[PDB]
Structure formats: C-alpha cells, structure tokens
C-alpha cells in the first residue's frame, strides 16, 4: 500500500503536468484526472486529523482564545444561519461605521508565521512554496492542524470540515457547466490542485528526511483539498509588520463574517498592528453582521469562495476582442488604441449593470468601427490627442454613425455568444424551478444561467443604444463637445 | 479610502 500510493501520485503528477489538451478535450482530461484522484482517495483514510462533536461546541474556545490575546469579543456571537452557514449575530445594537472588530497580528496565520513554523525547513528548500504564499498557507494550516500543541488550535477546530468549492463537486454537478466560460477555470482548479498534491506528496514522502513535519506520517488528498479550500475561501492580503510588502493571512474571528453587497469596511491598522472592521450598516440586536467581501464575480465566488451570490451587483462575463491583422486599417487602429493605452486585442468584461461596458471597452469598440477618415483625425493635428482623451466617454461620440456601428456589433456578438451555450435561459429557469437539486448543482446551474443573463442584457442595451443613435443620426443632431 | 483594505477571500493565482 505505501509504495502503491506513491506510484499513483507519480502517475497523477505526470498527467497533471502535461500541457493543455486543447479546449475541445478538456472535459475528457478532467474525467481522466478525476478517475486517478478518486482511486487515490478511496485508498486513503480521509482527513488525517478529525475532531469530535459538532461544530458549535468549539466556538466558545475560539472566543476565549481571541479575548486572551487582545481581540474584540464583545457585541456578537457565532450562530448557524440557514442560508450562509455559520456567521456573526449582533448581541447589541451596532451603528453604521462603528468599530466593532479588531484582531491583533499574533492571532493571524500568515506566510511569515508559516516560515517560522515546523514547515520552515521545507519552505526554505522548496521553490514552489517560496513562490506561492497561498500554497504555503495551506501547508501551514495542515501542519498546525496536525500539531496538538499548536497556538492556532482554537481557530483550526472551528473551521468547516468541508466546502462548496468545485473541488468537492460530483462529476455530474460539474457537467452542468459544459460549454460555459466558467468550466475552464473549474478544470484548471482541479488540475492545479491534483498536480500540487502529487508534487508535494513526492517531496514529503521521498525527500530527506523524516523531519518533525507532521505530514510525513499522513498526507492525504482529502487533507490537501480541505487545506486549499480553507485558504481560497478565507485568505486575505495584509501588509507585513514593516509595511514594506504584502503577505497572505488567515484572520480568525473576523473571517466568520458572511458577505452582502456594499463597500469594504475592513482595513489593516499598521501602527497598532491589527485588523479592524467597522459596521457596514446599522445592525440591530439579533441581526446577522455582514461585510462586503470584494467586487468579485459569481464565477469567482463559486470557484474560489464556494458560493453563488444572488443579486451580486459586480457580476460580469468575459468577452475577447481584437483588431485582426487582416484588417486593412490594422496599423491605424492599433496606433490609435496604443495612444489610448489599449492593446490591439484583450479580454474585456460585460457587466450585468447599466451600462454593461466599461470606458475601455467603449473606446476599443469605437476604434474598432472607425472609418479611415475618423482614424486620421485621432492621429494627426492639434486636436488628435483631445479626441483620444474622450474616446471612452459616452457623452462625446466620434460620430452618430460610429455609435450605431459599434452598438450593432455588440448586439450581434453578444447574440452570437448566447448561441454557444448548451441550454437556453428559459430551460435553466425551468430546471431550477421544476427540479430539486443539491446546493452544489444549483450553484452550477445558476452560474451558467448568470452568464447567459449577462449576455442577454448586453443584447438589449446594445439594441436600445443602436436605436437611440440611429434615430439621432436621421435627425442630424449636433455632436457635443 | 482605507489605506490597507482587507478583501475577504481575495482571489489568488494557483496556476
Ligand atoms: N452571502 C453568502 N451566501 C452563502 N454563503 C456564504 C455567503 N457569505 C459567505 N458564505 C459562506 O461563508 C464562507 C466564507 S467564511 C464565512 C464564514 C462561514 N460561513 C463559516 O461557517 O465558516 C464562504 O465559503 C461561503 O461558504
């Protein structure tokens, strides 16, 4: 059994180190990797370390541990919520902008504390750990979890034992995402995680020696999946003590806050060396205390945070666009885009808000649909730089005809993109209504629906904009300046 | 804005 598990990880390492198979064969590669991962996992014991009892029983010790090291423990409590898991509930009234949470650096798990832990020797020898603080944090977490005397034991014992990152999805749950934008990042996550587990399994088991490292006795695929999901769903960038650079960190107590829409109200206080959080809004006693995680898309929330957020006002989808070298106006268009600080081709974002395109995308699309005479006006003479200056401003168009052309293109390309999906918007909504699905399956289906709904909104915006400028073209309205 | 804003679960490259 011990050599057999080593042979399997060596095959897993080879498979997951191979170049990308091509987009048409990524699903096949994914199922091949799952098969090998699943065979390793059935031959292993699960998590190397587990803890008795229910998750609620450990939160009192987390609070006592935080209070004895200077953290705030007044005004809130840990409660199991129906829609978010566990989180903070105010035990008193909390007014907006009130400082209610602070966590000194001594409580944090950071790349620096990892370097100074039992992981230190391996970290100093391994070029991957030195390059990837997120992976180092994951191993920091595993090493301390396996250390009964660890200072961070009260925090590690309150972490979830399972997550809703795609690493935990069944194959048929990932299958819902076929033909979506998001599934490629799911494939990458799965292949990254498997390559890393196999790489470090061979480093730990094979490479001298039998260090004080607790991972030498037991390092399972379950261990690594749990550790990277803990880090990716909870990690944070903070300054170092010197304030000279940034590091990755796990922030106990405060990272139990669940997410809602709003603005970031959590910041690092370097002089007093502690994390600080002020109330996003008024929280009456008994209400859940929320924070704003960040302006991430639902693809990012699903893949890296393990949840889908309804009414995420920052949801977006990628759109790839570029001036082809086949265009006879390529040189002029590329020069205009260069002067505006835009590459000749890039990945842009379509947003589910109004307007759905950014200033950068609007500037690119304007150049994309520009005549040669219009491009010359953006290249030559005393007004050329000023015309570039307003290229991304919806109030100052190049011409009525230019607006109609660019909005026609966006309408057409978004409509084309809707037709590359396996299901329609209406069929997804009927799957979600008429069927009873797992939480993870609903996440996959709502994500593929969300992509199409964002494209659908772009079609409607572009159609309206098209008609607006086209009717103003017919009336020959004076162009603004 | 905050000098050192903290983003819960900030996204990082894992390759
Ligand atoms: N608005 C939301 N809806 C559903 N789940 C949420 C959420 N905000 C946060 N979560 C969950 O909380 C995790 C962030 S850590 C926040 C505390 C967590 N609920 C816990 O029990 O430890 C995410 O991975 C997600 O699973």
């Amino acid at each position: 059994s011990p050599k057999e598990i080593l042979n399997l990880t060596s095959e897993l390492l080879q498979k997951c180190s191979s170049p990308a198979p091509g987009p048409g064969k990524e699903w096949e590669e994914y199922v091949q990797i799952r098969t090998l991962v699943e065979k390793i996992r059935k031959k292993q014991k699960g998590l190397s370390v587990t803890f008795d009892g229910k998750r609620e029983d450990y939160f009192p010790d987390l609070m006592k541990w935080a209070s004895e090291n200077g953290a705030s423990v007044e005004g809130f409590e840990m409660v199991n919520f129906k829609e978010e898991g566990f989180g903070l509930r105010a035990t008193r009234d909390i007014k907006a902008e009130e400082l209610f949470l602070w966590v000194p650096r001594k409580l944090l798990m950071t790349v620096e504390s990892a370097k100074n832990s039992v992981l230190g020797p391996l970290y100093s020898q391994d070029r991957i750990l030195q390059a990837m603080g997120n992976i180092a944090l994951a191993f920091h977490l595993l090493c301390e979890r396996a250390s009964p005397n660890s200072f961070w034991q009260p925090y590690i014992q309150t972490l979830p034992s399972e997550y809703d990152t795609p690493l935990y999805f069944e194959e048929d749950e990932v299958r819902y995402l076929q033909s979506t934008q998001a599934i490629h990042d799911v494939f990458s996550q799965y292949k990254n995680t498997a390559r890393q587990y196999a790489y470090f399994y061979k480093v730990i088991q094979t490479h001298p020696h039998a260090n004080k490292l607790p991972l030498k006795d037991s390092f399972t695929y379950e261990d690594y999946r749990w550790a990277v999901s803990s880090v990716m769903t909870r990690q944070n960038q903070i300054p170092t003590e010197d304030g000279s650079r940034v590091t990755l960190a796990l922030i106990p107590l405060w990272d139990m806050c669940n997410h809602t829409n709003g603005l970031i109200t959590t910041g690092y206080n370097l002089e007093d060396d502690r994390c600080e959080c002020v109330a996003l809004q008024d929280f009456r006693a008994g209400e859940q205390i929320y924070i704003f995680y960040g302006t991430r898309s639902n693809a990012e929330f699903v893949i890296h945070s393990g949840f889908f957020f309804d009414n995420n006002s920052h949801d977006r989808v990628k759109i790839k666009l570029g001036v082809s070298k086949s265009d006879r106006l390529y040189a002029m268009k590329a020069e205009v885009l260069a002067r505006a600080g835009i590459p000749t081709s890039s990945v842009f974002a379509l947003h589910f808000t109004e307007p759905p395109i950014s200033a950068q995308l609007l500037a690119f699309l304007r150049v994309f649909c520009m005549t040669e005479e219009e491009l010359k006006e953006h290249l030559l003479g005393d007004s050329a730089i000023d015309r570039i200056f307003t290229l991304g401003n919806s109030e100052f168009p190049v011409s009525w005809d230019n607006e109609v052309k660019l909005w026609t293109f966006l309408e057409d390309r978004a409509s084309l993109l809707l037709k590359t999906y396996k299901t329609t918007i209406e069929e997804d909504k009927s799957v979600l209504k008429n069927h009873d699905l797992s939480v993870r399956a609903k996440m996959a289906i709502k994500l593929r629906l969300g992509e199409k709904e964002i494209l659908e909104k772009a079609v409607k915006s572009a159609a309206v904009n098209r008609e607006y400028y086209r009717q103003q073209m017919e009336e020959k309205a004076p162009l603004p300046k | 804005t905050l000098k050192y804003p903290i983003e819960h679960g900030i996204v990082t490259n894992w390759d």
Side-chain angles (χ1 to χ4, degrees), chain A residues 332-353:
Chain A
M332 276 185 292
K333 292 177 163 177
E335 185 54 35
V336 175
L337 295 172
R339 298 192 185 181
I342 301 173
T344 314
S345 55
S346 39
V347 188
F348 299 90
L350 293 174
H351 296 81
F352 192 47
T353 63

Side-chain angles (χ1 to χ4, degrees), chain A residues 55 59 78-88 158-160 162-165 229-230 232-234 253-261 288 290-291 293 296 301-302 304-310 443, chain B residues 8-9:
Chain A
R55 198 188 168 191
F59 281 115
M78 245 68 70
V79 170
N80 191 18
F81 291 100
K82 181 263 200 310
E83 268 145 26
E84 296 99 348
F86 280 81
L88 309 206
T158 58
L159 290 173
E162 182 180 24
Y163 300 93
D164 286 330
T165 58
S229 302
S230 295
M232 70 180 58
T233 59
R234 309 177 88 91
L253 258 75
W254 164 92
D255 74 3
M256 291 297 300
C257 293
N258 292 311
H259 163 89
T260 192
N261 263 316
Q288 178 171 182
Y290 292 92
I291 58 162
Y293 282 8
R296 308 204 286 273
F301 274 151
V302 164
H304 298 273
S305 286
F307 73 107
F308 184 92
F309 191 55
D310 310 316
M443 284 166 59
Chain B
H8 186 287

Side-chain angles (χ1 to χ4, degrees), chain A residues 132 134 192 195-196 233 235-236 255 266-268 293 296, chain B residues 2-15:
Chain A
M132 311 186 63
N134 48 358
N192 287 337
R195 178 183 57 258
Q196 291 156 13
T233 59
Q235 65 185 326
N236 315 275
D255 74 3
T266 310
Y268 206 85
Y293 282 8
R296 308 204 286 273
Chain B
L2 296 172
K3 184 182 180 183
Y4 299 115
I6 299 185
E7 161 165 0
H8 186 287
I10 186 174
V11 168
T12 70
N13 173 65
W14 303 74
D15 287 285

Side-chain angles (χ1 to χ4, degrees), chain A residues 38 215 252 267 308:
Chain A
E38 212 66 12
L215 279 29
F308 184 92

Side-chain angles (χ1 to χ4, degrees), chain A residues 99-201 203-208 210 213-215 217-260:
Chain A
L99 175 63
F100 72 102
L101 253 173
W102 54 96
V103 187
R105 189 185 289 265
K106 71 197 87 164
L107 295 176
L108 276 40
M109 297 185 78
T110 75
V111 180
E112 271 62 45
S113 68
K115 293 152 61 100
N116 299 320
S117 74
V118 62
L119 183 66
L122 180 58
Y123 180 99
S124 69
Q125 311 176 9
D126 189 84
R127 269 27 173 172
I128 300 315
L129 291 168
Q130 297 169 202
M132 311 186 63
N134 48 358
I135 296 187
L137 260 193
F139 278 101
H140 188 12
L141 198 53
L142 275 180
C143 285
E144 297 309 300
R145 177 189 184 91
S147 298
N149 55 327
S150 172
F151 174 74
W152 298 277
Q153 274 300 322
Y155 166 69
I156 299 173
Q157 293 179 15
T158 58
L159 290 173
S161 38
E162 182 180 24
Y163 300 93
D164 286 330
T165 58
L167 289 172
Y168 290 83
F169 279 37
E170 302 271 22
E171 177 186 333
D172 287 345
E173 289 169 330
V174 178
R175 192 189 301 277
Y176 290 119
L177 295 175
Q178 285 181 340
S179 90
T180 65
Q181 274 194 18
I183 197 173
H184 170 81
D185 295 323
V186 166
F187 293 152
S188 306
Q189 174 182 82
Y190 200 87
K191 187 180 178 178
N192 287 337
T193 300
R195 178 183 57 258
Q196 291 156 13
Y197 173 67
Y199 169 75
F200 284 112
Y201 193 84
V203 171
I204 291 172
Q205 305 299 323
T206 293
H207 289 0
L213 214 62
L215 279 29
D217 284 323
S218 192
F219 175 51
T220 63
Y221 176 81
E222 231 90 75
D223 292 331
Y224 192 63
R225 169 167 78 182
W226 173 87
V228 300
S229 302
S230 295
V231 165
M232 70 180 58
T233 59
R234 309 177 88 91
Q235 65 185 326
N236 315 275
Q237 277 200 1
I238 65 168
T240 51
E241 282 174 59
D242 321 52
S244 57
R245 76 181 91 96
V246 310
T247 180
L248 283 170
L250 302 181
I251 304 177
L253 258 75
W254 164 92
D255 74 3
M256 291 297 300
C257 293
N258 292 311
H259 163 89
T260 192

